[PDB]
Design a protein around this ligand. Sequence first.
Ligand SMILES: *C/C=C(C)/C=C/C=C(C)/C=C/C1=C(C)CCCC1(C)C
Ligand SMILES: [Cl-]
Length: 206
Amino acid sequence: VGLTTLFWLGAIGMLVGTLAFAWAGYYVTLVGISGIAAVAYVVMALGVGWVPVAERTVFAPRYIDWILTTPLIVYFLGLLAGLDSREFGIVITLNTVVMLAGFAGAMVPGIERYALFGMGAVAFLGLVYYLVGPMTESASQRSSGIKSLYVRLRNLTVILWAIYPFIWLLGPPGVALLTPTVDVALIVYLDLVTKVGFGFIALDAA
Ligand SMILES: *C/C=C(C)/C=C/C=C(C)/C=C/C1=C(C)CCCC1(C)C
Ligand SMILES: [Cl-]
């Protein structure tokens, strides 16, 4: 099982999700979430964007993907919760800090990269606070079914997103403990669940 095989698997999974969401069509956002990831995985499957950094290999399309798709996931959750256009700005700003810090830390060869990782971790804790607190208060004002859908997507999001920084740190970008193949396999699984699984839970409730 090679890296390219794993990338193709993620590509296929994102494509199936993309077509499913487009057919059922919120729906436009889900198409963007999995559609963008599909492209990133194909590019990586073709061997494009594999950037050598010191002694590790960094996958640049992954971070462009995350920077564009994760704010769309937060946007989807913000619509469910009924956020005013100002609350959107805070959470999307916090999200972008996490994503940019990870992208920069991955691309820096020296230990300064752990300083960038730490900053993303701090901003992530602030993002979790807004999901579990203010956004949950806001979602409470909606129908019982909308509130229930928000809570289920929120917990899926919070629990799984919290695993990514550990995979990053244990993988090549960090202490380089986990091997690239295992690290990639774990992230392909998480990407598929936080995007396509996310989407199908929304379809089921609709
Ligand atoms: C579809 C892709 C998803 C949902 C990716 C999520 C990624 C994260 C939640 C990553 C978080 C990180 C930290 C909290 C600190 C810095 C390193 C990151 C980017 C792995
Ligand atoms: Cl990476």
